Design a protein around this nucleic acid. Structure first.
Ligand SMILES: [Zn+2]
Lengths: 123, 34, 125, 298, 166, 40, 42, 29, 86, 112, 149, 123
RNA sequence: ACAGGAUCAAAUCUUCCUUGAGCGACUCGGCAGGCAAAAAAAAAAAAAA
RNA sequence: UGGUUGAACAAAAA
RNA sequence: UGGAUGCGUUAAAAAAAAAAAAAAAAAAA
RNA sequence: GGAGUCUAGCUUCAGUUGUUUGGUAUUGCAUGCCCUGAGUACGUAAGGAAAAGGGAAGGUUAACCGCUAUUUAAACACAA
RNA sequence: UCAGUUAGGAACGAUAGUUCACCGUCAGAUGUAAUACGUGAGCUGGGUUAAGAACGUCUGGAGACAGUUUGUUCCCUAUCUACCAUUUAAAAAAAAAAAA
RNA sequence: GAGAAGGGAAA
RNA sequence: GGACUCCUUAACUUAAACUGAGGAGUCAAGUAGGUACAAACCGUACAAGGAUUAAUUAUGUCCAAAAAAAA
């Protein structure tokens, strides 16, 4: 086009990067207080639900994972055919612990039962 | 124009109101124009 | 009196909404329902009869499942008392125990912890 | 709690008993004892947003830049601003970093808050506040915020509370014009508000009408430029003015929206925060970059 | 500079000679609600369920709002809330049962209402008058309000209205 | 555009149309003369 | 004053008969501590 | 007499917070 | 309303309508009409064609119905002139 | 400086003093180097300047803040006539500040 | 503590400026003829030399300044210069007026007595105040008071 | 009146370092000097609580400057005092008595009773 | 609380299940603090004896 | 029917 | 050793923001 | 059926529902004058833009007291 | 001309009781209308509509003029609505004595 | 299906 | 030397709850119902008084608000 896009395109541009700092409604079906990964059939379904609740694109999630994961995990990602996030969401490939940790960092919620380490011992 | 005389009657008034103009003005216009 | 209660628009996002068949977080109306008119005889009797029916049904129950179902049914009835809690515990012991992690029993346990200081015979609990 | 005259005399004699100035290092090294074991670097995505921090307004002074330009600057101190908890979607329903700052005497602290501080393994805190942030920008509990969080030259969005001026009329509270000082003006009209609304048709005084009242004491936000930072004393010198009294709480965060798009698009920033590498030496004092063109050109 | 938002008549035919001159929807075609593809065809609707509790006396209705008109559902809900279906109805109490309505996102308003309708909320002594919010905005932020605001103003304006509303 | 209170076909190539402006608007489009483009 | 409704078409609740227990308020009697004594709930 | 336009008094965006506005928000809560 | 103490009955009727102020502006200007709870495009008077029967008097209905009728779409319309009937 | 101020002439055109009749300052903060219009009130017999010339302020009595924290003030308020983006006169007497923003500065013996 | 921190920052800034400065500030006071050469534009390498008599020295640690004044071609001009400005190239004393008078003007002194608490300029009669004595409205003289005492 | 108006009108107000006595500043200074002279002569004065709090600082100043024994401090004390009896008492009794006292030569005691005639707190 | 439960039984450091969302979160329970005095622009500043 | 769409267009229809 | 004000200085960014005064499965206190 | 603190939800200037090797993204917005594009496109000449940024006045709202000015003050305890 | 999710703004004077206007400067952004031609229990009082007095004009006159002038006391301590400020609480005043 | 032109909202 | 509705008129700008005529109806001096809300329109088997029975007046029959859609 010319030096100006259509006004519809400009409005969609502005709305494309909307970022809300609130979860301000309890009538929504989305990740909130008390989220349980096990409510969904598998990790892929839980991940898709969490990402859609966050309002993030598969490409952005995958880019963050690739750019923040370690070198060996990056090499594994490169070797893997197709897109790892898409395969995980489709339930075609099982992620590693580091990959899951980075995905959880991205989406704000756990995807499997989170294990906390206590220091308790029976006498 | 304004309510006290320009207001039309309603079902139950049988086409008349105590201070209404509209009906007679319309009838006069129909009879001899303006 | 005037019962001030309003439903607000809020700050949700339902454009391009996708149906996951998952429940929403909470009920929309959480403000206390304060009746602004006095009850009738039947209304007040129905309001207060849990104080009889709870203990009667705890006694009639011959299973931990029944005991916990009755307690859950009367969960919203206030105000529970130490003898209510003690009767529930005694009936549970007699029927033969239950999973101490079942959420129905967790209701009882959390209530006991809440009213611990008001128990006269805490050692019995 | 002394008498007025005693306090006045102590204020007068304050200068004679100041501590000697400390010796500021040029470079410092950080060891593992000052780095949280779970603090690790992150490369942000488009939605990543870092946390702010809390500081105390200390004073203001004039500083010369590289070209010789004089700027009035406000000094703020991050007085042991420490992360005390993390808010999370599943655990709290939202995401934020909880930060405590200052020191409060134990004889003034309450027992449950003392228990909170003991759980946090920190001295009693003066104030606590949240900073909403992205999931990837959450900081580990126990980390201490440093002025190195902010790159000099960056724009920062600052929030605070304006001072209280007491009860003021319309003339002083809103700058109303009043009336002439002469020409027959009545005494009650010299500083009067004049008319306060329309007439019988609307038959009200509109809400938010400007009238006399207790002036000041409002939440005010501004933009500042990070002029200088000193890591030794956790001092940040911000260009301009900031609302509040000397010693009042101040929130400092990255510029946003138009300011970020116009000023911070090319200034690199540390994510989630400054992550020191053990054994490496860093400058103690950092200045903002100089203007490319000579301010005294015309 | 700013201009009007794109309505439903910017995305389909317009027949000025017909009574229904253009099809109007709560959102654009691409923004209409739908079921997640793998999580579909697993559920069915009974459309209405009733729970009777003779001990407490508080009975429940659970209704499916998918494909129902807002006003048509609101009138029925008002009847149930008042309790006029009961032989012991009394105007001086909230004599009806409790009601749950699901699938408010799938409520329908016939005609051009989705594009035209607005809602007002009074603001005392405010020089700018009542706050006006768009029907599409309400549908995007909280679809339940669409049914709630119809039911509230179909209820009698007496002091019992908040109780039945609650 | 020629803003009118009425629309008429000025030549053999004029035709009636509906425009999706701020609202739906009736109008006349013409391939031959730009001055024949009308909006009611 | 009048309105869009009908002035005399607003039903008023009333009793179609009289009786002696109109004003008898409800009050709580003491309740058994030992419902285990009854055979049905023994 | 000639008068300035003072069109800035019609501003509707970027207005500073006031006690009246905060009390209004509290009332509407 | 507001600072206008007394206005015409028609202006008050327009002011009370529950629609967006821009559709209300269209209604005021005459490019749209409010009818039975809906905002619609006004009926179109086509030179040489009979009007919709609803718009004519009961005694004129038969004569109007005997006139030629257009059953196409706006693109096919060959009428020399058209305007909103009022 | 502001409307109705009386200002001298720094150039050698012959104008002795003039009255400011045009300036953009609502309050009397008339800066040095500001564009003004004046009405001539006194002139030498040989002066050929017009009655209502435009110009720029070069000196003022009120202190002016410099970008480096220094302050400069003079003992008079003076302006110079400008025509076609040029000074009508050939020389301007006395010292001038560096912040005038007009090449007329080059006609001054001192630039402080 | 805030004020002491400000004082320490002032001192360290003064130390840094003194280190970076390449010349020594001379001893001078009011009445001394002084010459200051300072930068005009760095990129254009333009400089300015001002010669004038000292009429004020304002000692405020980092914010200390001094005022010079001179007449050029019959036009007075005075300039206040910060003492620690990095745009000064040179500062010299052309003539000195070293004297006990200069030492006095340089030193800060204290009131001889407490009689300043009288605040005699506030010993006044208002326009509408009752006539106590023959004093006209405004500040009242003390001649009669002294005579009576 | 209404007591809450004190809070209302003092919201956001500073305490005056000096309490202002009635009359013009010269009259106030004369009153303070006269009462300081009387306090020196009597060793104790029954006053209103605010007046005692106000005069305490001038008593302290008198003692502090009288101890220094220089012409300047002597002139300061002379400007503060009126009567020869007060001068003699100060220099010949209070100064030797406080020779080793660095500071804080006076005290104010609140009587915790309201004066009968006008309900003035006393000290 | 790793508190309770299952198993041909878990990398140190729980393979899972339960704990409706382990009470909104973290604490306290001899906790909590209205008034006086003494101070005090909002606030802050005194351990007890 | 197509995010094609600020005062701009394409497909189909009768 | 200081206070206030503008004739002084700075900002004009955030609005799901800054902030607030009522945690609410409690339906007859 | 209790407390301390931090908060969720709700509310609020105008207003909208407009988003699916590398992998979009904090710009809604808007007086004039000056500089860059550029004496270029356009025009026989005369003349003379735009997309994107930047500087200097002027003004409005808000805050602040490092500087400047005005106006005011204060002038008190190192040494055992 | 049409169009908004309506976003930021449009300086001062001479004569003059003036409004609307004329003239001058700055700018290069005529704005228009309503709100009891908004607002005098918020201000002024220049014009204008009392007692005095004068000029022109009309009558025989006292007097007068939709002719011109000079002088001439502009009240109210706010009850209610509205608005701006403002406000511990369960308790830290008193009292609240059952069961039979 | 109508000044349905009191409010909601219906074929 | 009354008001408004209706019919027929003169005057008015085929204006005004304007002015002025000739006839009927209500108000005036007549409640309770309908017509959204303070006379004049509709309707009355018009109001002595009491009562928890009944009637197709005007006019209604999605809700506010009484009143139809078996298999
Ligand atoms: Zn044509």
């Amino acid at each position: 086009m010319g030096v100006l896009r259509s006004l519809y395109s400009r409005v969609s541009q502005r709305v494309w990067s909307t970022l809300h700092f609130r979860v301000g409604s309890r009538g929504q079906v989305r990740t909130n207080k008390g989220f349980k990964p096990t409510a969904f059939p598998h990790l892929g379904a839980a991940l898709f639900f969490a990402r859609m609740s966050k309002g993030l694109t598969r490409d952005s999630v995958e880019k963050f994972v690739r750019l923040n994961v370690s070198e060996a995990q990056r090499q594994e990602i490169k070797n893997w055919p197709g897109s790892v996030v898409r395969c995980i969401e489709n339930g075609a490939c099982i992620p590693s612990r580091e990959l899951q940790s980075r995905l959880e960092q991205v989406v704000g919620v756990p995807l499997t039962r989170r294990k906390k380490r206590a220091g308790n011992r029976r006498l | 124009n304004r309510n006290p005389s320009a207001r039309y009657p309603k079902k139950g008034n049988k086409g008349c109101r105590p201070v209404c103009r509209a009906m007679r003005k319309i009838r006069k216009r129909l009879r001899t124009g303006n | 009196f005037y019962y001030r209660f309003h439903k607000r628009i809020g700050k949700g996002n339902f454009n391009r909404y996708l149906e996951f068949y998952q429940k929403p977080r909470g009920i929309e109306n959480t403000l206390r329902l304060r009746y602004n008119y006095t009850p009738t005889f039947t209304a007040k009797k129905r309001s207060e009869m849990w104080k009889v029916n709870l203990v009667k049904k705890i006694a009639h129950a011959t299973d931990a499942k029944q005991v916990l179902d009755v307690w859950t049914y009367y969960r919203h009835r206030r105000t529970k008392r130490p003898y209510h809690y003690l009767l529930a515990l005694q009936r549970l012991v007699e029927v033969g125990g239950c999973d101490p992690t079942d959420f129905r029993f967790r209701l009882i346990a959390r209530g006991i912890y809440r009213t611990a200081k008001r128990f006269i015979n805490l050692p019995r609990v | 709690y002394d008498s007025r005259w005693v306090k006045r005399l102590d204020r007068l004699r304050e200068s004679k008993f100041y501590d000697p100035a400390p010796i500021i290092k040029e470079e410092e090294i950080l060891e593992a004892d000052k780095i949280h074991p779970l603090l690790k670097k992150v490369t942000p995505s488009w939605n990543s947003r870092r946390t702010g921090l809390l500081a105390y307004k200390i004073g203001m002074m004039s500083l010369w830049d590289g070209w010789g330009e004089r700027h009035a600057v406000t000094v703020c101190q991050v007085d042991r601003c420490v992360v005390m908890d993390q808010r999370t979607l599943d655990k709290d329903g939202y995401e934020a970093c909880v930060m405590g700052i200052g020191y409060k005497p134990i004889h003034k602290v309450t027992k449950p808050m003392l228990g909170v501080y003991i759980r946090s393994q920190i001295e009693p805190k003066s104030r606590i506040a949240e900073f909403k942030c992205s999931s990837d920008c959450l900081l580990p509990v126990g980390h201490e915020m440093s002025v190195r969080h902010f790159t000099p030259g960056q724009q920062v969005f600052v929030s605070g509370w304006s001072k209280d001026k007491g009860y003021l009329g319309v003339k002083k509270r809103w700058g109303f014009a009043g009336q002439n000082a002469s020409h027959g003006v009545e005494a009650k009209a010299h500083s009067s508000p004049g008319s306060i609304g329309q007439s019988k048709t609307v038959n009200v005084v509109w809400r938010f009408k400007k009238m006399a009242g207790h002036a000041g004491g409002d939440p005010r936000v501004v933009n500042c430029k990070v002029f200088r930072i000193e890591a030794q004393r956790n001092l940040i010198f911000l260009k301009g003015c900031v609302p509040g009294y000397k010693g009042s709480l101040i929130k400092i965060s990255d510029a946003r929206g138009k300011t970020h798009h116009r000023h911070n698009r090319h200034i690199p920033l540390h994510f989630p925060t400054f992550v020191p590498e053990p054994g490496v030496s860093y400058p103690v004092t950092l200045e903002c970059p100089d203007a490319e063109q000579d301010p005294f050109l015309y | 500079s700013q201009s009007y938002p794109k309505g439903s008549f910017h995305e389909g035919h317009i027949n000025p000679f017909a009574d229904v001159q253009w099809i109007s929807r709560p959102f654009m075609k691409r923004n209409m609600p739908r079921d997640h593809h793998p999580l579909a065809k697993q559920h069915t609707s009974l459309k209405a369920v009733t729970m009777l509790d003779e001990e407490s006396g508080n009975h429940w209705h659970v209704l499916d709002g998918k494909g129902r008109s807002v006003g048509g559902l609101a009138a029925q809900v008002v009847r149930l809330l008042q309790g006029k279906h009961r032989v012991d109805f009394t105007p001086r109490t909230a004599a009806g049962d409790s009601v749950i309505v699901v699938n408010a996102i799938h409520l329908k308003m016939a005609g051009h209402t989705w594009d035209t309708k607005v809602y007002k909320f009074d603001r005392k002594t405010h020089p700018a008058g009542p706050k006006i919010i768009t029907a599409k905005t309400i549908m995007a932020r909280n679809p339940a309000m669409i049914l709630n605001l119809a039911v509230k103003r179909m209820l009698p304006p007496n002091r019992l209205r908040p109780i039945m509303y609650r | 555009m020629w803003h009118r209170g009425t629309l008429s076909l000025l030549c053999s190539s004029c035709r009636y149309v509906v425009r999706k402006w701020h609202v739906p608007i009736l109008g006349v489009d013409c391939n031959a003369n730009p001055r024949h483009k009308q909006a009611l | 004053g009048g309105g869009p409704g009908r002035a005399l078409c607003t039903p008023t609740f009333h009793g179609l008969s009289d009786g002696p227990y109109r004003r008898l308020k409800f009050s709580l009697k003491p309740i058994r501590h030992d419902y285990r004594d009854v055979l049905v709930s023994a | 007499r000639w008068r300035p336009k003072k069109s800035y008094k019609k501003r509707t965006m970027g207005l500073p917070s006031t006690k009246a506005r905060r009390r209004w928000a509290q009332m509407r809560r | 309303a507001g600072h206008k103490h007394s206005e015409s009955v028609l202006q008050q009727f327009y002011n009370r309508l529950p629609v967006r102020k821009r559709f209300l502006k269209a209604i005021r200007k005459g490019t749209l009409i409010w009818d039975k709870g809906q905002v619609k495009i006004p009926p179109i008077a086509m030179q040489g064609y009979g009007l919709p029967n609803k718009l004519v008097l009961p005694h004129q209905k038969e004569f109007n119905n005997k006139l030629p009728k257009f059953k196409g779409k706006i693109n096919q319309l060959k009428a020399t002139r058209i305007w909103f009937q009022d | 400086l502001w409307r109705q101020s009386i200002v001298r002439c720094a150039d050698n055109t012959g104008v002795i003093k003039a009255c400011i009749i045009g300036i953009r300052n609502k309050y009397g903060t008339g800066k040095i180097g500001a564009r003004i219009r004046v009405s001539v009130r006194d002139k030498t017999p040989e002066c050929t300047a017009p009655k209502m010339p435009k110009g720029v302020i070069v000196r003022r009595r009120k202190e002016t803040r410099r970008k480096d924290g220094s302050y400069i003030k003079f003992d008079e308020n003076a302006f110079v006539i400008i025509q076609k983006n040029k000074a009508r006169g050939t020389k301007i007497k006395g010292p001038v500040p560096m912040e005038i923003r007009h090449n007329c500065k080059t006609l001054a013996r001192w630039i402080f | 503590t805030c004020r002491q921190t400000m004082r320490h920052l002032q001192q360290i800034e003064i130390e840094r400026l003194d280190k970076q400065r390449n010349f020594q500030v001379p001893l001078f006071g009011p009445g001394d003829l002084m010459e200051v050469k300072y930068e005009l534009s760095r990129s254009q390498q333009t400089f300015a030399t001002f010669q004038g008599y000292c009429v004020e020295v304002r000692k405020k640690r980092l914010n200390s300044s001094f005022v010079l004044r001179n007449s050029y071609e019959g036009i007075g001009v005075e300039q206040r210069i910060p003492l620690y400005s990095p745009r000064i190239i040179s500062l010299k004393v052309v003539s000195s007026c070293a004297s006990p008078t200069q030492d006095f003007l340089l030193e800060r002194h204290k009131p001889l007595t407490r009689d300043y608490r009288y605040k005699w300029k506030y010993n006044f009669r208002g326009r509408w105040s009752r006539r106590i004595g023959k004093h006209k409205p405004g500040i009242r003289s003390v001649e009669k008071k002294i005579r009576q005492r | 009146g209404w007591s809450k108006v004190v809070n209302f009108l003092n919201k956001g107000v500073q305490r005056r370092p000096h309490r202002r006595l009635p009359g013009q500043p010269h009259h106030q200074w004369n009153m303070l000097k006269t009462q300081l002279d009387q306090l020196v002569r009597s060793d104790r004065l029954e006053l209103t609580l605010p007046r005692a709090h106000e005069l305490q600082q001038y008593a302290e100043e008198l003692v502090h400057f009288a101890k220094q024994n220089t012409p300047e401090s002597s002139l300061i004390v002379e400007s503060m005092i009126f009567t020869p009896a007060a001068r003699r008492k100060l220099f010949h009794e209070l100064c030797p008595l406080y020779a080793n006292r660095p500071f804080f030569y006076t005290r104010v005691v609140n009587q915790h009773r309201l004066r009968m005639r006008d309900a003035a707190p006393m000290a």
